[PDB]
From a paper:
MPO is a heme Fe3+-containing peroxidase with a protoporphyrin IX as the basic structure of its prosthetic group. The porphyrin ring of MPO is covalently attached to the enzyme via two ester bonds (Asp260 and Glu408) and one electron-withdrawing sulfonium linkage (Met409), and features a histidine as a proximal ligand (His502).
Here, we present a new crystal form containing four homodimers of human MPO at 2.6 Å resolution. We could capture the binding of the serotonin-transporter inhibitor paroxetine, which is known to be one of the few irreversible MPO inhibitors, in the crystal structure of the native enzyme. Clear electron density is present for paroxetine bound in four of the eight monomers of MPO. Every MPO homodimer has only one paroxetine bound and this is with a partial occupancy of paroxetine ranging from 1.0 (full occupancy) in chain A to 0.73 (partial occupancy) in chain H. The reason for the non­saturation of MPO by paroxetine is probably because of its lower concentration (25 µM) compared with MPO (138 µM) in the crystallization condition. In our crystal structure, thiocyanate is found in the same position hovering above the heme porphyrin ring. The final model contains eight polypeptide chains of mature MPO and 30 glycan chains on an asparagine side-chain ND2 atom, or in brief N-glycosylation.
Numbering used by the authors:
A (entry chain A): 166 to 272, 279 to 744
B (entry chain B): 166 to 269, 279 to 744
The structure:
């Protein structure tokens, strides 16, 4: 059973909820907000058996839907005047705090075969594909690991390998073996392990991982730079993400250092926990104070996230299956380059803009092409992409995803849609209904909902009914909320999820007993610009709201102008 | 994939809901309305490991709770002036339409706590069981995902959730074909080939490996019956109702053959089955449930039907399997049999319940079903009172004749809720939007009974830990109902989903013609008894309320029969 008193989070999230102690813990099934919809009722995804209809209509190929609706010419790309690319990157990093859906290891081999045999669910290629002319080819896809393998009885559900809580588990890990390996066990300073072979202008980099089949090595053979080791396994997927992970590692070590000065008699354990506790609170505050309001807009923010009252032990904090797909809205924010800038915020030469298809798993570009400062600068001073109904997502992810390290480039929009079918998620209208929103039955009604009859027509041509529209596709097709970057449906799902992660987290930073009133006063002062200042060689940063500020010099200030975190109230006699 | 058109229910309930076709089908996990509460978070029930507390307090022995709170002296028993014993029996029969939770080696003879056994420990100073090294046998319910460290243990419903008379027809296709008369093209159910009840049909016999009905008598050598549900023989009153509905099927198939001579056996079976199903729905929702819930809760939880809603989940909830056991408080300690003058039928007009369990011989050799049905109609149910919860015939002597020791059904109810990982009273109160008492004083207010509140806190320590059955049946009854607010909410909520989420609900456009629905509105359970037994005087009005001979009785000739005119075809 659970300790009747405790001071800190467990690593796995076990015991956050004392009455049902696995809720929000790692390696458990997702909760379902709606009953699953599988071709055979309990296991096989729609699109599995050729010729089998969904709810009266043919299943559209995920790749076909991507081609006809998501595809757009890259020269048309609209930059978001009101959002930085840091808005995109915080979303990915946050996602990697919340959910990871494990797949079986490459092994019959889904990566090299186009045979549809468990556990493979390859994406078929439509006729007249702009890229893949051989229709006997396919895009690789492994089905998500089931919670109960080989069962006839259970309705297939998938697994979340992370703690659902906003607890910085992407830094500290969600399993105890990994969480100990991430720590510096050389001394009693309560530090996280740092790279022993390289530094970034004197500052720390993430340790290297020891992988059986390391993909970062494939991106540059001569460089011989492996993937990094972090709390989450996807830390090296793009260098912008790596940058944020690195930034938070440093911030942990900085805090543990300052707490050692302040409380000299604290051992390594106490320093680690207390630093971890703060980093967690900082991720909560940036997310709920700065990030989410700009996702949802002010109306939805009031509706779905009213003022915090207190912890409610009857609120289920698990990640919902649908959330893993809906929170992928952020794929519409992705620019087709990685932007690097020098200390004058000027294109850092020789390669200021690297195509995304050449940065995936390219840990070598962090170690050998100037560290994280140029990348963080690019995030702060470049605009996000804007989602528009005829410019949904760029070809660097739709045509060339992981191009360097796979037999064929993937299509992330199409994977989003195959994945929703794999997970047995209901269609657009079922989720509309779940959210208390009107459900369009006809092309005209869908036109009204989308304020776009052209797009409504394309969707009905693919899907036949709005009942069958894949949740991602429908969600991101919707016109955006005032001062937000999602439509009503995604607002509802995302809002609902984050409310539960807050109200049902016993260690929420505002919950009575977690922090003293003076510590909460102090924590209210933190910001992400400040964290960049404290832990990089950057001295000019974005004005608050870092997710909106996107134009040099107009939206920038000196580091000296910003309030630091005062750790005075953490001192003990 | 589901047939895009169909006329009749599948046997398994597959394809009722076309978007999620397993919903309400047989042999699937229960739905959870709340997250499970297990000692280890995912599998072990509270009370499993000695010394491990629940939510700050020791776990009370289920048998101790039964002894201190459920036990009452049988001479104090209060009869319900407003409810027949038929009200009790229809509840059990309906339950056997909705849910059966299957179990799996050594649990029947061993008191060692080793999976899958979860034996009930005996407290000191037990009124009945003096040997503290003994125990009450208990098998844990089967898990949906055996041996998993990942999944939160959930249990299985072997029946169709729908109100579809699956206790008559079966919930699996092998069994459903064996229940049919495949000798001819009349669409009949199989009847007993060795015995009759004054010329009328009895249920076939089952072929069981370990048949308990044989143990009851022994010289009589009468095995258990075979029905849609495996529990048909558990008491003869239940057997009577099963038998009654078998006859009613065969009667309807007969009349439809006259009316439509060119219909084959399949068409007759399905069309008769369709009617019997509608009759079970109508008696349940029109006659039964209003008297369970009372008029307030009935309006709240079961407003006027509109139409089928394919987004309503019709699965049975895990908690319902335990909450709907409220009907154990309605059970009288005798089986009552009456002759055609409604007078004690000799020999043995009142048999102790501990001598009727699995006693199929008493149907075949002691006068058939007419005396039993008469006893149900003309005897009062027991009334649930806070100091008279459940009788010792089920608390002390359950299944005494057919196993090594008498069971305690109230205690099993409570061990079972822990087995299933159900939250305690307050979590369910909260789920229902009801106030959650934290102190003995608040619990006194809620129960309108400070004495009972004190006893419960002595056992449980907090209202958070009170077992759902125990808490539910402790609550004062609603005006003109026989459950409190919490059970009203759970039961009401469940039956609303079974109605609004059933594609084959009898009022749903397209199931029956408008003329067939006019005709079906006329059916009643008294009528069904008339049509299919040698009984000619039956209960008035609301059979579940009518409980006193002659005051509440009428002649069969006074009642309208079911007009099958609108079932005729060219
Ligand atoms: C601590 O947090 C608990 C969880 O709250 C939910 O999650 C949090 C994060 C917020 O988003 C909350 O706003 C959200 O509600 C709270 O407990 C919940 O309280 C509500 C209100 O009393 C309870 O609702 C009641 O549910 C009864 C049972 O029926 C429910 O379940 C069925 C199957 O699950 C489903 O068919 C029903 O639709 C219903 O589901 C609820 O729907 C309503 C509205 O869409 C929601 O408000 C509920 O959250 C849903 N619950 C679930 C579990 O999915 C109903 O009978 C009852 O409504 C009846 O009475 C009211 C007036 O009395 C009438 O308006 C209405 O006509 C109806 O007849 C009510 O809806 C809910 O079950 C509780 N959840 C749990 C886990 O117990 C706590 O209240 C909160 N405590 C504090 C101090 O803040
Ligand atoms: C756990 O935590 C500890 C403490 O925080 C980490 O210790 C650090 O290890 C790294 C790498 O293993 C060291 O970096 C190397 O530094 C040497 C020279 O060290 C000197 O200069 C430092 C510069 O600021 C200075 O801090 C050092 O002072 C400390 O150490 C001395 C002597 O032990 C001690 O007495 C003092 O009191 C201080 O504690 C010292 O003056 C440098 O030569 C190395 O160069 C490498 O890289 C180059 C390429 O640029 C390569 O070409 C070289 O040949 C070589 O490979 C390297 O930069 C760092 O000095 C350590 N810091 C401290 C505070 O001890 C430890 O790593 C953590 N473990 C894990 C797993 O994270
Ligand atoms: C057909 O039936 C559908 C299900 O009906 C339910 O069961 C039947 C038998 C009745 O009891 C009925 O009353 C039940 O509703 C029905 O769909 C349901 O419609 C409601 C209302 O639109 C939906 O509730 C809304 O849900 C969203 C999402 O949150 C829910 O899920 C989370 C996670 O599980 C829970 O924590 C929440 O408590 C919710 O349960 C909510 O965001 C939303 O509340 C917000 O918006 C409303 C309206 O503005 C505000 O009043 C609130 O304060 C919030 O701001 C609602 O709670 C429900 O999800 C939905 N269920 C399904 C399965 O879709 C359907 O409408 C019926 N249709 C017809 C045609 O008859
Ligand atoms: C490479 C990828 C990115 C590069 C910038 C990227 C970005 C984001 C943002 C901005 C997100 C949210 C705001 C976000 C969320 C989630 N993603 Fe996505 N993403 C990249 C790559 C992937 C890939 C590949 C997947 C898996 C696709 C598949 O179905 O096979 C992916 C998923 C997700 C996801 C679900 C996570 C999970 O539980 O497994 C998000 C919530 N991303 N990304
Ligand atoms: C013998 C038993 C009965 C009568 C002589 C009897 C009566 C009822 C009524 C009147 C019910 C509803 C109003 C009702 C519901 C449910 N019961 Fe209960 N019951 C008798 C015996 C049992 C036994 C034995 C069990 C199982 C005991 C255990 O848990 O160890 C039992 C259960 C149930 C039940 C749950 C059924 C399931 O899903 O498996 C009801 C809904 N009854 N009974
Ligand atoms: C088990 O079943 C047997 C029947 O198979 C039961 O035996 C029966 O007991 C009754 C007791 O009244 C006998 O009734 C008697 O019948 C005779 C002849 O008409 C009559 O003279 C007596 O006055 C009385 O009415 C019945 O005949 C007898 N049947 C047989 C075949 O022996 C037995 O009692 C059952 N087990 C029990 C209840 O312990
Ligand atoms: C199947 O149905 C037939 C016809 O309804 C049953 O046959 C009758 O059986 C009774 C007694 O068992 C006989 O006395 C009648 O003379 C038979 N009637 C006819 C028309 O043949 C048959 O027994 C049924 N089978 C089962 C298993 O119930
Ligand atoms: C692979 O990594 C090497 C580092 O090992 C990167 O480049 C090297 O190539 C640059 C390209 O202009 C040279 O200017 C560098 O001096 C050189 N560095 C070393 C140590 O050899 C190389 O560009 C990477 N390859 C690709 C195609 O990106
Ligand atoms: F640890 C993890 C990181 C990323 C994931 C991703 C989840 C979505 N599906 C694709 C997965 C990436 O798999 C890859 C990527 C590059 C490769 C590779 C396989 O073989 C050699 O080069 C899974 C596990
Ligand atoms: C689960 O854990 C138990 C208890 O230690 C172990 O005996 C069992 O073999 C494990 N099984 C699986 C399938 O993970
Ligand atoms: C039923 O008919 C009988 C005659 O068989 C008659 O005496 C009796 O009064 C009728 N009604 C009632 C209520 O018993
Ligand atoms: Ca987490
Ligand atoms: Ca049924
Ligand atoms: Cl879901
Ligand atoms: Cl290293
Ligand atoms: Cl905040
Ligand atoms: Cl368009
Ligand atoms: Cl700078
Ligand atoms: Cl439940
Ligand atoms: Cl037989
Ligand atoms: Cl009705
Ligand atoms: Cl025996
Ligand atoms: Cl009392």
């Amino acid at each position: 059973t659970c300790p009747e008193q405790d001071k800190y989070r467990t690593i796995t999230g076990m015991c956050n909820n004392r009455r049902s102690p696995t809720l929000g813990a790692s390696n458990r099934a997702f909760v379902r907000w709606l009953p699953a919809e599988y071709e055979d009722g309990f296991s096989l995804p729609y699109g599995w058996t050729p010729g089998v209809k969904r709810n009266g209509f043919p299943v559209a190929l995920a790749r076909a839907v991507s081609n006809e609706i998501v595809r757009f010419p890259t020269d048309q790309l609209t930059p978001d005047q009101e959002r930085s690319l840091m808005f995109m990157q915080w979303g990915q990093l946050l996602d990697h705090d919340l959910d990871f859906t494990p797949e079986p290891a490459a092994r019959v081999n889904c990566e090299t075969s186009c045979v549809q045999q468990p556990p493979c669910f390859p994406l078929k290629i439509p006729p007249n594909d702009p890229r893949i002319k051989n229709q006997a080819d396919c895009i690789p896809f492994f089905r998500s690991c089931p919670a109960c393998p080989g069962s006839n009885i259970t309705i297939r559900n998938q697994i979340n390998a992370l703690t659902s809580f906003v607890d910085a588990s992407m830094v500290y890990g969600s399993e105890e073996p990994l969480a100990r390996n991430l720590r510096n066990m050389s001394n009693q300073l309560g530090l996280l392990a740092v790279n022993q072979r390289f530094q970034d202008n004197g500052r720390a980099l993430l340790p290297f991982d020891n992988l059986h089949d390391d993909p970062c090595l494939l991106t540059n053979r001569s460089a011989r730079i492996p993937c990094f080791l972090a709390g989450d396994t996807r830390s090296s997927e793009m260098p912008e993400l790596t940058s944020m992970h690195t930034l938070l590692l440093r911030e942990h070590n900085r805090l543990a250092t300052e707490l050692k000065s302040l409380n000299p008699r604290w051992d390594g354990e106490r320093l680690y926990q207390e630093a971890r506790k703060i980093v967690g609170a900082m991720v909560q505050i940036i997310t709920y104070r700065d990030y989410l309001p700009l996702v949802l807009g002010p109306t939805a923010m009031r509706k779905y996230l009213p003022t915090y009252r207190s912890y409610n032990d009857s609120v289920d904090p698990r990640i919902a299956n649908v959330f893993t797909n809906a929170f992928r809205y952020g794929h519409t924010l992705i620019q087709p380059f990685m932007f690097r800038l020098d200390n004058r915020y000027q294109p850092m030469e020789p390669n200021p803009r690297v195509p995304l298809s050449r940065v995936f798993f390219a840990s070598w570009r962090v170690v050998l092409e100037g560290g994280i400062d140029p990348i963080l600068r690019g995030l702060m001073a470049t605009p996000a992409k804007l989602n528009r109904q005829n410019q949904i997502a760029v070809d660097e992810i739709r045509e060339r995803l992981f191009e360097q390290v796979m037999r064929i480039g993937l299509d992330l929009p199409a994977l989003n849609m195959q994945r929703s079918r794999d997970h047995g998620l209901p269609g657009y209208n079922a989720w509309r209904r779940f959210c208390g929103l009107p459900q369009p039955e006809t092309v005209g009604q869908l036109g009204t909902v989308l304020r776009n009859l052209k797009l409504a027509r394309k969707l009905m041509e693919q899907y036949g009914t709005p009942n069958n529209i894949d949740i991602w596709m429908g969600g991101v097709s919707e016109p955006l909320k005032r001062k937000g970057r999602v439509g009503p449906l995604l607002a509802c799902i995302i809002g609902t999820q984050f409310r539960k992660l807050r109200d049902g987290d016993r260690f929420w930073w505002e919950n009575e007993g977690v922090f003293s009133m003076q510590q909460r006063q102090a924590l209210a002062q933190i910001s992400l610009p400040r964290i960049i200042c404290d832990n990089t060689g950057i001295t000019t940063v974005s004005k608050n709201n870092i997710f909106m500020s996107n134009s040099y010099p107009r939206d920038f200030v000196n580091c000296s102008t910003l309030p630091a975190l005062n750790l005075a109230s953490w001192r003990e006699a």
